[PDB]
Design a protein around this ligand. Structure first.
Ligand SMILES: Nc1ccn([C@@H]2O[C@H](COP(=O)(O)OP(=O)(O)O)[C@@H](O)[C@H]2O)c(=O)n1
Ligand SMILES: Nc1ccn([C@@H]2O[C@H](COP(=O)(O)OP(=O)(O)O)[C@@H](O)[C@H]2O)c(=O)n1
Ligand SMILES: Nc1ccn([C@@H]2O[C@H](COP(=O)(O)OP(=O)(O)O)[C@@H](O)[C@H]2O)c(=O)n1
Ligand SMILES: Nc1ccn([C@@H]2O[C@H](COP(=O)(O)OP(=O)(O)O)[C@@H](O)[C@H]2O)c(=O)n1
Ligand SMILES: Nc1ccn([C@@H]2O[C@H](COP(=O)(O)OP(=O)(O)O)[C@@H](O)[C@H]2O)c(=O)n1
Ligand SMILES: Nc1ccn([C@@H]2O[C@H](COP(=O)(O)OP(=O)(O)O)[C@@H](O)[C@H]2O)c(=O)n1
Ligand SMILES: [Mg+2]
Ligand SMILES: [Mg+2]
Ligand SMILES: [Mg+2]
Ligand SMILES: [Mg+2]
Ligand SMILES: [Mg+2]
Ligand SMILES: [Mg+2]
Lengths: 153, 153, 153, 152, 153, 152
């Protein structure tokens, strides 16, 4: 259904390198609907929990330190297939494997400085959204372009 | 041969969502030559004929209604391999399958709101060009850049 | 009134230099509505008439020859203040006087190769639209975005 | 360089997919984002934000529209950012705004003019205080600060 | 005459902030012709001589130190009125006074970090070009678009 | 991260006003420009640069065209930049290149394919040595190096 949601974050390198607007533009251009947006400074414990599935991996310590080293921009986007589609926009995890046209393909080199995050499944997206956003920070609204973007609307 | 031609249309969602300029720019940037251009309101019967091969498909009635719901921009582009190359610029029919960099990859979500059309073969292109354009509507001209774009020119 | 209309043309240098998409994009981005569009080859006599007020000027013969030397893209745009606003988007007649941000400011050098034309008043626009377009060539439609662009809509 | 301003993408700007474009322009200029939120103003927030226009005949419509859907509120930091932000936005009436500015490139009607920016250092301080809690601002150092400023 | 030339430099901040391509694009888009291009590290003495007219000004010391602190990209552009036109593209000296659409209007804040330089007169342009470029580094060529950009060509 | 590659805008790319666009793509990616020059290759330079194609039937035409007008030669530095540069360029035949790449967005014909990039670390070292004198390369530290690389 077009009401699917995903969590996207500009990581601290993406904020530092002035990629916030560019990343948001790509999601707006695609037809996805912005329903949550904030600038925040993750704590180490927040980073640990966000990446909890990766706790045994050797990059985890550095990942958690880096993710909490400076501000991120957290977002919630709504749209048909937006979890998968958000990942398509981001490009492959390792920028070396990402193609031009994607965020990581255009703007990143190193897997540890890969500028952005996106939820990897509908289930993890729900968890991430719930973790980073309060219900008061999510806005219910209708895009005036909804019938131009979706057939069934 | 560099004189190959194809029919590209901005569908009514593409016009509504202000993608006419962006789509033309992509074709110009590639090196293709614009030889026909018009804004028109297809009739339902024109839409039925344009998509006649698809008459048995479950989506046909909706396709034909939508395509005739408002203005399209019809184009004829000329260049080496332009039929296939135009379709590559458009991206996969279903935008969920389209890659970033392409028109559908960058701007569309839903297969029924996929912003554009391109002819699928040399012979269908000839048919579509003849259906939408009278002989006197095409403009033959030489790009000042033809020898920078083509080795053989 | 938001139903005001103007005639804009991409002149033959603008077509040759692949500025058609870029010019249309600027008008779409502004909120103006495309209601007429075609590619055509003006005749010398059409060019003489289009610029008839300038018949005594030293540049007229060159202007009329050039304007009829290859294809133009003719457009009719609709929107509040579109005659004046279209000219603002174009920039100063002589590109040496045009500011960055405008079409001439960004893309042109020479007053005789200034890439585009726009009607200079409401009444000249009506004349130019009638000269270049038959009634049946215009397309009336409602932008899905009209109430986001205009308070009164 | 620690001057701050409040910039909002108005509901028309959100609806018309200009959030990223607007943020990009401010990032490109060298300004630093220190606050960002998406919210739908209440009627009362809309009345207060525009409190100096309460006696104008366009007020109730401005209030209703500003509270009709989400805005994006921003706090930007930088040398001369109050004046600079308004230069990026362009003239209040898009008819008067020049290409290159946000209103010049994207808006037609004064009542649907896409964005807001504080008009002075003091009004910025008041708008920031109105729209953001203390804990919602983020203090950080751009790694590019010495490239943007001589005195850093 | 269209053979006028000017010296443009991306200053060390402009190089550091990844504005080389953007600056070159703006000059290419305008119709100006690139006839010299190099990356170099100015010496302090080179910076002193380049800015010799400003030797008594209180910012001079800091200007010369900064200009020689890292690489610049030096360019020579050719075109009708290119000295004045290059300055128009750059925008006002102090970015606070520069308008959006210009290089300094779009990308700079501080007069001491104003990302680029352009010659201020035909005479100073000749001096600057001669100072920064050897004759072997200037390329004589003809743009295939010269007749599309200039009437008299 | 100290890997280097040679990228050239070919004479068609210069003529078609793609120099800035190409440089922008490499800067945006995070790669560092350490050499840059505009020059018109001699016939002999064109023959040598393409020496591994000397037995091909398209050679003399490639040589004549490559020496017909100015190119822009570049040296870029960064992790995996040889492979990365070629990914940015796209497939050799623009018919096979995808949108988003330089050839995918801007070229049609294999003989007018806008740009060149070294095919390997060793060929890059040889191309760099051929096109640039030692004194023409500039060593410098991007202020953004720690934002682009974890190990910096
Ligand atoms: N070998 C690796 C793998 C991942 N990572 C980082 O760990 C993050 C999370 O890994 P992940 O497997 O969930 O990948 P994504 O979901 O981000 O694509 C990545 O986005 C990288 O920034 C790393 O630094 N080195
Ligand atoms: N399952 C489908 C397939 C196609 N369509 C629409 O029907 C149009 C014509 O289908 P097609 O098979 O000719 O595909 P293209 O030639 O447009 O790639 C597509 O462009 C879609 O807009 C659809 O709505 N649902
Ligand atoms: N001194 C001049 C004035 C105008 N012209 C050309 O003549 C066209 C018509 O002139 P105009 O006075 O109607 O100006 P616009 O309405 O195009 O601003 C201009 O757009 C120029 O292309 C010229 O070549 N030399
Ligand atoms: N005559 C007017 C004046 C202002 N307005 C709106 O009211 C807003 C606030 O007015 P203002 O005087 O504070 O102008 P700015 O601070 O936005 O430049 C404007 O941005 C317009 O959207 C209007 O609709 N009609
Ligand atoms: N008050 C000033 C004036 C100039 N400058 C710097 O000195 C440079 C040369 O000054 P200039 O008067 O030749 O200005 P332009 O020709 O660069 O516009 C400027 O581009 C500034 O970078 C400064 O740092 N502070
Ligand atoms: N069949 C071919 C193959 C290559 N070429 C040209 O020769 C150049 C060098 O060939 P190459 O095999 O080194 O390919 P790349 O390294 O450029 O990918 C290509 O970039 C083409 O411009 C051609 O014109 N026809
Ligand atoms: Mg993950
Ligand atoms: Mg089909
Ligand atoms: Mg006129
Ligand atoms: Mg105000
Ligand atoms: Mg000066
Ligand atoms: Mg090769």
């Amino acid at each position: 259904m077009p009401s699917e949601r995903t969590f996207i974050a500009v990581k601290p390198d993406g904020v530092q390198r002035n990629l916030v607007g560019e990343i948001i533009k790509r999601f707006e251009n695609k037809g996805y609907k912005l329903v949550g947006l904030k600038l925040l400074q993750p704590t180490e414990e927040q980073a640990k929990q966000h990446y909890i599935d990766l706790a045994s991996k050797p990059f985890y310590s550095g990942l958690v330190s880096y993710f909490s080293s400076g501000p991120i921009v957290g977002m919630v986007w709504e749209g048909l297939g937006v979890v998968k589609g958000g990942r398509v926009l981001l490009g492959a995890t390792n920028p070396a494997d990402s193609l031009p046209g994607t965020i990581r393909g255009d703007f990143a080199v190193d897997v540890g400085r890969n500028v952005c995050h996106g939820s990897d499944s509908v289930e993890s997206a729900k968890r991430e959204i719930a973790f980073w956003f309060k219900a008061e920070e999510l806005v219910s609204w209708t895009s005036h372009s909804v019938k131009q973007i979706y057939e069934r609307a």
